[PDB]
From a paper:
Bromodomains (BRDs) are protein interaction modules that specifically recognize ε-N-lysine acetylation motifs, a key event in the reading process of epigenetic marks. The 61 BRDs in the human genome cluster into eight families based on structure/sequence similarity. Despite large sequence variations, all BRD modules share a conserved fold that comprises a left-handed bundle of four α helices (αZ, αA, αB, αC), linked by loop regions of variable length (ZA and BC loops), which line the Kac binding site and determine binding specificity. The four helices form a deep cavity that is extended by the two loop regions (ZA and BC loops), creating a largely hydrophobic Kac binding pocket.
The insertions at x3 are present in the N-terminal domain of BET family members. Our SPOT array and ITC data showed that multiple Kac sites are generally required for specific recognition of the histone H4 tail by all human BET family members. For the first BRDs of the BET family, a spacer of two glycine residues was optimal. Binding of di-Kac marks separated by three residue spacers as found in sequences linking the H4 K8/K16 and K16/K20 required a glycine or a hydrophobic residue in the first linker position for optimal binding to the first BET BRDs. For instance, recurrent t(15;19) chromosomal translocations that result in a fusion protein that comprises both BRD4 or [name] and the NUT (nuclear protein in testis) lead to an aggressive form of human squamous carcinoma (French, 2010a; French et al., 2001). The recent development of potent and highly specific Kac competitive inhibitors for BET BRDs provides a compelling case for targeting these BRDs for the treatment of an extremely aggressive subtype of squamous cell carcinoma that is caused by chromosomal rearrangement of [name] or BRD4 with NUT (Filippakopoulos et al., 2010; French, 2010b).
Numbering used by the authors: 34 to 144
The structure:
């Protein structure tokens, strides 16, 4: 069984964010080819997405919740690194990130 905090990341944080109307671009790794970057992987050194995070939770990958939180931070920050302030995807990420912060502020204690 995962830590209680990792269960929270799965059953509250991911579950809530996944259902948000703006979450879908984050469901899978950014495919530079389907969208030839051609430069994406030249700037984005550590790609991350919520599909990967969800799989890691399901597959028991994380040792502690901090690692999962870091993956979310990487996902959001990467979006901002690559995109302009006025881009639709940035507004989408911002909405999701505000929810992420509100939910991780309520993360439970391990007992
Ligand atoms: Na934990």
């Amino acid at each position: 069984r995962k830590t209680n905090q990792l269960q929270y990341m799965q059953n509250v944080v991911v579950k809530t964010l996944w259902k948000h109307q703006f979450a879908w671009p984050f469901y899978q790794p950014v495919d530079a080819i389907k969208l030839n970057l051609p430069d994406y992987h030249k700037i984005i050194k550590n790609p991350m997405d919520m599909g990967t995070i969800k799989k890691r939770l399901e597959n028991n990958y994380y040792w502690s919740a901090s690692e999962c939180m870091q993956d979310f931070n990487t996902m959001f920050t990467n979006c901002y690194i690559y995109n302009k302030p006025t881009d639709d995807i940035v507004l989408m990420a911002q909405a999701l990130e505000k929810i992420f912060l509100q939910k991780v502020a309520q993360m439970p204690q391990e007992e």
